[PDB]
Amino acid sequence: MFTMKLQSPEFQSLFTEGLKSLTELFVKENHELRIAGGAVRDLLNGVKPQDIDFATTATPTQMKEMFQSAGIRMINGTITARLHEENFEITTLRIDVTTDGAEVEFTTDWQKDAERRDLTINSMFLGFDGTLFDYFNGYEDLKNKKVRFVGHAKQRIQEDYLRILRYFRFYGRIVDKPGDHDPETLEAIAENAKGLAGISGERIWVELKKILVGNHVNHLIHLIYDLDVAPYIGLPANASLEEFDKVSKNVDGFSPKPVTLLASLFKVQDDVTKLDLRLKIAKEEKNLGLFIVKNRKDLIKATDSSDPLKPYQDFIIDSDATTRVCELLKYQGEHCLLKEMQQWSIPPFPVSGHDIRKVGISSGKEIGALLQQLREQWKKSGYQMEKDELLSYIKKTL
Amino acid sequence: MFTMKLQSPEFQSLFTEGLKSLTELFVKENHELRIAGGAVRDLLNGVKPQDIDFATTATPTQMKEMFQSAGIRMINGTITARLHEENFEITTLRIDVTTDAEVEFTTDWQKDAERRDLTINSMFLGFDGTLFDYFNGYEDLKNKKVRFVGHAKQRIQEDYLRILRYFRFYGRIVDKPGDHDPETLEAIAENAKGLAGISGERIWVELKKILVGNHVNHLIHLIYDLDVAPYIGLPANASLEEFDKVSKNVDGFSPKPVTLLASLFKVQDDVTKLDLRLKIAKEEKNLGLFIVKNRKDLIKATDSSDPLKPYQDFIIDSDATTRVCELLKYQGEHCLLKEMQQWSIPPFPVSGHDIRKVGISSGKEIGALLQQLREQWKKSGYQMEKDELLSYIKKTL
Ligand SMILES: [Cl-]
Ligand SMILES: [Cl-]
Ligand SMILES: [Cl-]
Ligand SMILES: [Cl-]
Ligand SMILES: [Cl-]
Ligand SMILES: [Cl-]
Ligand SMILES: [Cl-]
Ligand SMILES: [Cl-]
């Protein structure tokens, strides 16, 4: 028969020498291997996936044995094999066992493993021929832009409260015009938001960062506040949503770091330190937040000036600074200054003691006095004058 | 009082704007600065020195502060300053600390002199021309004596490369070779094996200086006689008769070091073995191979119209000129060497359009006639010019 199979440049680009060797090994050893989960959703949406999860009927012991006998190196129910300088993370199909005191049972039933997954658009498998295995209407849901739980929203949320944030993230990722949400899902989120207080800051921060750099971040942050999710994920309860609205417009299209956008919710430095206590963020992330909150009102472009970028250049010359300044320029919506700053090479002071000796000066004190005069001119020019102009200038002084 | 100070054109020639600026700086900052080492020996021998070693009581930290404070550029216990388009390498006086390498800075000139190797290299010269000599180096220099500060055995064992230094400086200062201090020869012979622990790069630097310096014949003989040869990458069974002939052949004609060395090599494998030990440059290796391969067969066309022709043919058929000129030096062909060095490689002087003119229009016929002329031109030793070749071909037609 003829049947529908996926074909695209995004799918084709996955078939590296490693992947071809892996798929041939599993065929040879009579174990089914398929792409699973988020990679499938990405492929169906026309995007090459990264960090693919592969799924198999082989148990972890069978995979170990097979890789061992085939001379294939393993790294790290999941086994990671390395073939042709590429890693492949492969997980045995499983069913969760209900316990009072976490346990799974391996299975070869693809439909049972699909039923374990959260959202219908993430519950699908793809064969390497392009056959789609879809047990929960995920394909139709994806096409209709519906973000829906496998089974009942309340039950799936109460199994892992982080799925509240996943709902938001995938909604941003697939929806075109935001606004339509299933009321049973919103009800489930609002009633169970408090469950997020029991989830690690690390897990939350991973998802929140994806929401912040993803599409429809304005809609989603508003919904997070509107459903009272915000307090349980380390966000201040009384944020300036007006500032967030301005800043989200400012950074749109300019690849903000997640903390850049999050800082528009912070009134004071203490909100960064409170967020850190909850979400356990990296030093770089915290310092970025403090930098923006500290400098957003005062470190601003010069107006009626020869170089509007001069205050920012000063801050950089006087002292990681460039990254922080560029984020600030995004935050402030200074689109016509952002790229200039990204492309600005920090110039050293271009005049040396020797340059002054060459114009006839011999005294150390006099050389230092002249260099100081030249540093001031150089800084005054917005760090733009070069050696000859500066030396020309000093010869006049003399 | 009146005292003896050095005065010569060679000493005066050092006093550039740079050197004057440098000396004034050290006086103003109250640090003694003197010329040291080999530059002093050269000056005492009547020659302007090239890569002068300056010595000072100032520490390296003091010199960096002095130069920075004065806006003077430093380059890369030694500090190098650039003033008035010239570099000056200045080293703080030091003493070596015995360890199971470390030094201590000193302001005692005599202690730094005692660290130096040979008495003729252990002196200092003030910029007024005062000589500071703690180990009889001036007397040894005038008497042509190459003598260690302290005992030869102990100094050689601190740095076995000092064996080659002894040879080098013996060739440099002695006029009639033959008198060697027996304690020094004994120290060399007993410790020659220690050169096996010295890197080939360091050895090759010194060996090259010996090969292009005076009295190379005596020195290579002494290297073999004292059994230093096997430890510095030379073959044990060399043809010293060939060496004697070639050292006489190249004398006065500035041989490259490998040109003279190749006279010790019986076959190409000796070049390859020297290279394994001494890690020589590709051009140095290829010169050795060229000489060994060609010395017997690439020879002048005796009793011919152009004796140089074999060599010219080699160059035309394909660094070849440099290699051939070294071969001519090797071979003692003094009456051919300069002619080759001044020979411009001539292009074949006739083109197809010359054959066309008074031609001949067929491309095929043009190429046949040009071939005939290339042949006459080569036959003539590449000296016939366009007009002579065209007259020749007109006759042929
Ligand atoms: Cl690898
Ligand atoms: Cl958790
Ligand atoms: Cl507000
Ligand atoms: Cl960190
Ligand atoms: Cl600077
Ligand atoms: Cl060494
Ligand atoms: Cl012999
Ligand atoms: Cl030609």
PDB file of C-alpha atoms in Angstrom, chain A residues 138-306:
ATOM      1  CA  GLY A 138      -1.269  14.540  18.817  1.00  0.00           C
ATOM      2  CA  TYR A 139      -0.907  15.306  15.139  1.00  0.00           C
ATOM      3  CA  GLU A 140      -4.380  16.805  14.859  1.00  0.00           C
ATOM      4  CA  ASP A 141      -3.860  18.720  18.115  1.00  0.00           C
ATOM      5  CA  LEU A 142      -0.565  20.109  16.829  1.00  0.00           C
ATOM      6  CA  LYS A 143      -2.151  21.251  13.571  1.00  0.00           C
ATOM      7  CA  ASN A 144      -5.101  22.794  15.388  1.00  0.00           C
ATOM      8  CA  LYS A 145      -2.669  24.427  17.871  1.00  0.00           C
ATOM      9  CA  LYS A 146      -4.140  22.696  20.901  1.00  0.00           C
ATOM     10  CA  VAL A 147      -2.031  22.064  23.989  1.00  0.00           C
ATOM     11  CA  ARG A 148      -3.888  19.234  25.761  1.00  0.00           C
ATOM     12  CA  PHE A 149      -2.946  16.659  28.379  1.00  0.00           C
ATOM     13  CA  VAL A 150      -3.047  12.974  27.714  1.00  0.00           C
ATOM     14  CA  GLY A 151      -5.836  12.036  30.119  1.00  0.00           C
ATOM     15  CA  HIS A 152      -7.228  14.642  32.578  1.00  0.00           C
ATOM     16  CA  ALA A 153      -5.343  17.896  33.222  1.00  0.00           C
ATOM     17  CA  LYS A 154      -5.872  17.838  36.982  1.00  0.00           C
ATOM     18  CA  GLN A 155      -4.564  14.314  37.356  1.00  0.00           C
ATOM     19  CA  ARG A 156      -1.506  14.852  35.150  1.00  0.00           C
ATOM     20  CA  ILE A 157      -0.656  18.120  36.918  1.00  0.00           C
ATOM     21  CA  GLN A 158      -0.915  16.513  40.366  1.00  0.00           C
ATOM     22  CA  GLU A 159       1.580  13.835  39.201  1.00  0.00           C
ATOM     23  CA  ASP A 160       4.249  16.553  38.424  1.00  0.00           C
ATOM     24  CA  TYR A 161       3.366  20.115  39.192  1.00  0.00           C
ATOM     25  CA  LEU A 162       6.095  21.367  36.852  1.00  0.00           C
ATOM     26  CA  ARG A 163       3.673  20.403  34.041  1.00  0.00           C
ATOM     27  CA  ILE A 164       1.898  23.712  34.781  1.00  0.00           C
ATOM     28  CA  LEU A 165       4.966  25.547  33.385  1.00  0.00           C
ATOM     29  CA  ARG A 166       5.272  23.049  30.515  1.00  0.00           C
ATOM     30  CA  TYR A 167       1.695  23.877  29.520  1.00  0.00           C
ATOM     31  CA  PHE A 168       2.642  27.563  29.277  1.00  0.00           C
ATOM     32  CA  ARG A 169       5.872  26.883  27.423  1.00  0.00           C
ATOM     33  CA  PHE A 170       4.312  24.692  24.714  1.00  0.00           C
ATOM     34  CA  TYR A 171       1.364  27.040  24.390  1.00  0.00           C
ATOM     35  CA  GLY A 172       3.867  29.812  23.541  1.00  0.00           C
ATOM     36  CA  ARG A 173       5.684  27.481  21.244  1.00  0.00           C
ATOM     37  CA  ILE A 174       2.817  26.347  19.044  1.00  0.00           C
ATOM     38  CA  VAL A 175       0.046  28.939  19.217  1.00  0.00           C
ATOM     39  CA  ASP A 176      -0.232  31.709  16.663  1.00  0.00           C
ATOM     40  CA  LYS A 177      -2.810  34.096  18.150  1.00  0.00           C
ATOM     41  CA  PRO A 178      -3.023  33.616  21.899  1.00  0.00           C
ATOM     42  CA  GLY A 179      -6.255  33.718  23.815  1.00  0.00           C
ATOM     43  CA  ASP A 180      -8.127  30.434  23.470  1.00  0.00           C
ATOM     44  CA  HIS A 181      -7.437  28.155  26.491  1.00  0.00           C
ATOM     45  CA  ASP A 182      -9.424  25.152  27.582  1.00  0.00           C
ATOM     46  CA  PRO A 183     -11.272  26.177  30.730  1.00  0.00           C
ATOM     47  CA  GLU A 184     -10.731  22.742  32.433  1.00  0.00           C
ATOM     48  CA  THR A 185      -6.984  23.275  31.965  1.00  0.00           C
ATOM     49  CA  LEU A 186      -6.929  26.798  33.374  1.00  0.00           C
ATOM     50  CA  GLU A 187      -9.062  25.583  36.288  1.00  0.00           C
ATOM     51  CA  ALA A 188      -6.569  22.725  36.944  1.00  0.00           C
ATOM     52  CA  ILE A 189      -3.654  25.160  36.877  1.00  0.00           C
ATOM     53  CA  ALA A 190      -5.280  27.740  39.163  1.00  0.00           C
ATOM     54  CA  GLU A 191      -6.370  25.094  41.697  1.00  0.00           C
ATOM     55  CA  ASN A 192      -2.931  23.407  41.732  1.00  0.00           C
ATOM     56  CA  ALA A 193      -0.568  26.329  41.360  1.00  0.00           C
ATOM     57  CA  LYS A 194       0.441  25.997  45.036  1.00  0.00           C
ATOM     58  CA  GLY A 195       1.886  22.553  44.170  1.00  0.00           C
ATOM     59  CA  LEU A 196       4.724  24.362  42.411  1.00  0.00           C
ATOM     60  CA  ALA A 197       6.000  25.411  45.862  1.00  0.00           C
ATOM     61  CA  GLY A 198       7.064  21.786  46.289  1.00  0.00           C
ATOM     62  CA  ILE A 199       9.115  21.716  43.045  1.00  0.00           C
ATOM     63  CA  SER A 200      12.933  22.393  43.087  1.00  0.00           C
ATOM     64  CA  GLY A 201      14.081  25.841  42.078  1.00  0.00           C
ATOM     65  CA  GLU A 202      16.429  24.242  39.509  1.00  0.00           C
ATOM     66  CA  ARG A 203      13.658  22.472  37.627  1.00  0.00           C
ATOM     67  CA  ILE A 204      11.475  25.555  37.636  1.00  0.00           C
ATOM     68  CA  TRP A 205      14.286  27.798  36.391  1.00  0.00           C
ATOM     69  CA  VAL A 206      14.957  25.557  33.397  1.00  0.00           C
ATOM     70  CA  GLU A 207      11.338  25.846  32.225  1.00  0.00           C
ATOM     71  CA  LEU A 208      10.922  29.510  33.082  1.00  0.00           C
ATOM     72  CA  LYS A 209      13.987  30.434  31.040  1.00  0.00           C
ATOM     73  CA  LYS A 210      12.470  28.612  28.032  1.00  0.00           C
ATOM     74  CA  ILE A 211       9.234  30.530  28.484  1.00  0.00           C
ATOM     75  CA  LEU A 212      11.106  33.841  28.737  1.00  0.00           C
ATOM     76  CA  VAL A 213      13.084  33.382  25.451  1.00  0.00           C
ATOM     77  CA  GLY A 214      10.185  31.744  23.617  1.00  0.00           C
ATOM     78  CA  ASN A 215       7.255  33.165  21.669  1.00  0.00           C
ATOM     79  CA  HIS A 216       4.311  34.993  23.279  1.00  0.00           C
ATOM     80  CA  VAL A 217       6.225  35.669  26.460  1.00  0.00           C
ATOM     81  CA  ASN A 218       4.034  38.713  27.158  1.00  0.00           C
ATOM     82  CA  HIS A 219       0.813  36.649  27.070  1.00  0.00           C
ATOM     83  CA  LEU A 220       2.388  33.910  29.157  1.00  0.00           C
ATOM     84  CA  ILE A 221       3.838  36.100  31.925  1.00  0.00           C
ATOM     85  CA  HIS A 222       0.459  37.780  32.215  1.00  0.00           C
ATOM     86  CA  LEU A 223      -1.233  34.404  32.453  1.00  0.00           C
ATOM     87  CA  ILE A 224       1.271  33.300  35.123  1.00  0.00           C
ATOM     88  CA  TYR A 225       0.287  36.291  37.163  1.00  0.00           C
ATOM     89  CA  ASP A 226      -3.403  36.019  36.353  1.00  0.00           C
ATOM     90  CA  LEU A 227      -3.608  32.366  37.536  1.00  0.00           C
ATOM     91  CA  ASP A 228      -1.452  33.101  40.683  1.00  0.00           C
ATOM     92  CA  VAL A 229       1.409  30.883  39.568  1.00  0.00           C
ATOM     93  CA  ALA A 230       3.880  33.752  40.010  1.00  0.00           C
ATOM     94  CA  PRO A 231       4.314  33.603  43.852  1.00  0.00           C
ATOM     95  CA  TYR A 232       5.210  29.893  43.777  1.00  0.00           C
ATOM     96  CA  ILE A 233       7.975  30.278  41.206  1.00  0.00           C
ATOM     97  CA  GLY A 234      10.022  33.014  42.832  1.00  0.00           C
ATOM     98  CA  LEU A 235       8.437  36.031  41.005  1.00  0.00           C
ATOM     99  CA  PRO A 236       7.478  39.128  43.101  1.00  0.00           C
ATOM    100  CA  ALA A 237       3.776  39.191  43.859  1.00  0.00           C
ATOM    101  CA  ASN A 238       3.405  42.881  43.084  1.00  0.00           C
ATOM    102  CA  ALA A 239       5.510  43.222  39.924  1.00  0.00           C
ATOM    103  CA  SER A 240       5.314  46.276  37.597  1.00  0.00           C
ATOM    104  CA  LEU A 241       3.496  44.679  34.816  1.00  0.00           C
ATOM    105  CA  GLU A 242       3.570  48.097  33.080  1.00  0.00           C
ATOM    106  CA  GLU A 243       7.375  47.954  33.027  1.00  0.00           C
ATOM    107  CA  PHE A 244       7.235  44.327  31.868  1.00  0.00           C
ATOM    108  CA  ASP A 245       4.940  45.401  28.995  1.00  0.00           C
ATOM    109  CA  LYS A 246       7.390  48.114  27.940  1.00  0.00           C
ATOM    110  CA  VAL A 247      10.442  45.923  28.229  1.00  0.00           C
ATOM    111  CA  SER A 248       8.946  42.905  26.486  1.00  0.00           C
ATOM    112  CA  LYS A 249       8.237  45.220  23.519  1.00  0.00           C
ATOM    113  CA  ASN A 250      11.786  46.647  23.802  1.00  0.00           C
ATOM    114  CA  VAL A 251      13.580  43.260  23.644  1.00  0.00           C
ATOM    115  CA  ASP A 252      11.348  41.559  21.067  1.00  0.00           C
ATOM    116  CA  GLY A 253      13.481  40.431  18.104  1.00  0.00           C
ATOM    117  CA  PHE A 254      16.781  41.074  19.907  1.00  0.00           C
ATOM    118  CA  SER A 255      17.420  37.807  21.659  1.00  0.00           C
ATOM    119  CA  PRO A 256      17.311  38.929  25.300  1.00  0.00           C
ATOM    120  CA  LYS A 257      18.955  36.816  27.968  1.00  0.00           C
ATOM    121  CA  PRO A 258      16.132  35.500  30.190  1.00  0.00           C
ATOM    122  CA  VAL A 259      17.167  37.579  33.191  1.00  0.00           C
ATOM    123  CA  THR A 260      17.055  40.770  31.085  1.00  0.00           C
ATOM    124  CA  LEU A 261      13.354  40.343  30.570  1.00  0.00           C
ATOM    125  CA  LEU A 262      12.705  39.000  34.075  1.00  0.00           C
ATOM    126  CA  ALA A 263      14.332  42.116  35.610  1.00  0.00           C
ATOM    127  CA  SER A 264      11.460  44.251  34.312  1.00  0.00           C
ATOM    128  CA  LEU A 265       9.425  42.578  37.104  1.00  0.00           C
ATOM    129  CA  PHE A 266      11.939  43.612  39.798  1.00  0.00           C
ATOM    130  CA  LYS A 267      11.474  46.969  41.562  1.00  0.00           C
ATOM    131  CA  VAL A 268      14.592  46.758  43.677  1.00  0.00           C
ATOM    132  CA  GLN A 269      17.783  44.770  44.004  1.00  0.00           C
ATOM    133  CA  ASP A 270      16.255  42.686  46.832  1.00  0.00           C
ATOM    134  CA  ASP A 271      13.895  41.087  44.282  1.00  0.00           C
ATOM    135  CA  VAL A 272      16.889  39.590  42.464  1.00  0.00           C
ATOM    136  CA  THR A 273      18.288  38.179  45.693  1.00  0.00           C
ATOM    137  CA  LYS A 274      14.833  36.749  46.520  1.00  0.00           C
ATOM    138  CA  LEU A 275      14.567  35.165  43.117  1.00  0.00           C
ATOM    139  CA  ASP A 276      18.032  33.601  43.571  1.00  0.00           C
ATOM    140  CA  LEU A 277      17.093  32.128  46.955  1.00  0.00           C
ATOM    141  CA  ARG A 278      14.172  30.347  45.281  1.00  0.00           C
ATOM    142  CA  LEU A 279      15.533  29.480  41.855  1.00  0.00           C
ATOM    143  CA  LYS A 280      19.259  28.963  42.662  1.00  0.00           C
ATOM    144  CA  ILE A 281      20.410  30.865  39.599  1.00  0.00           C
ATOM    145  CA  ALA A 282      23.982  31.105  38.268  1.00  0.00           C
ATOM    146  CA  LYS A 283      26.256  33.891  39.534  1.00  0.00           C
ATOM    147  CA  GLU A 284      26.224  35.435  36.014  1.00  0.00           C
ATOM    148  CA  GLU A 285      22.443  35.440  35.991  1.00  0.00           C
ATOM    149  CA  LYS A 286      22.156  37.083  39.409  1.00  0.00           C
ATOM    150  CA  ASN A 287      24.766  39.743  38.582  1.00  0.00           C
ATOM    151  CA  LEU A 288      23.002  40.555  35.345  1.00  0.00           C
ATOM    152  CA  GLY A 289      19.742  41.095  37.199  1.00  0.00           C
ATOM    153  CA  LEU A 290      21.416  43.323  39.788  1.00  0.00           C
ATOM    154  CA  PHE A 291      23.179  45.266  37.037  1.00  0.00           C
ATOM    155  CA  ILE A 292      19.943  46.073  35.161  1.00  0.00           C
ATOM    156  CA  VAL A 293      17.964  46.952  38.281  1.00  0.00           C
ATOM    157  CA  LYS A 294      20.843  49.213  39.435  1.00  0.00           C
ATOM    158  CA  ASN A 295      21.577  50.953  36.151  1.00  0.00           C
ATOM    159  CA  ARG A 296      18.375  50.971  34.076  1.00  0.00           C
ATOM    160  CA  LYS A 297      17.282  54.519  35.115  1.00  0.00           C
ATOM    161  CA  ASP A 298      20.720  56.189  35.264  1.00  0.00           C
ATOM    162  CA  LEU A 299      23.036  54.631  32.680  1.00  0.00           C
ATOM    163  CA  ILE A 300      21.351  56.100  29.608  1.00  0.00           C
ATOM    164  CA  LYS A 301      22.335  57.597  26.281  1.00  0.00           C
ATOM    165  CA  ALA A 302      23.862  61.044  26.080  1.00  0.00           C
ATOM    166  CA  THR A 303      21.506  63.455  24.329  1.00  0.00           C
ATOM    167  CA  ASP A 304      22.500  66.427  22.199  1.00  0.00           C
ATOM    168  CA  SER A 305      25.871  64.661  22.029  1.00  0.00           C
ATOM    169  CA  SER A 306      28.594  63.715  19.581  1.00  0.00           C
TER     170      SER A 306
END
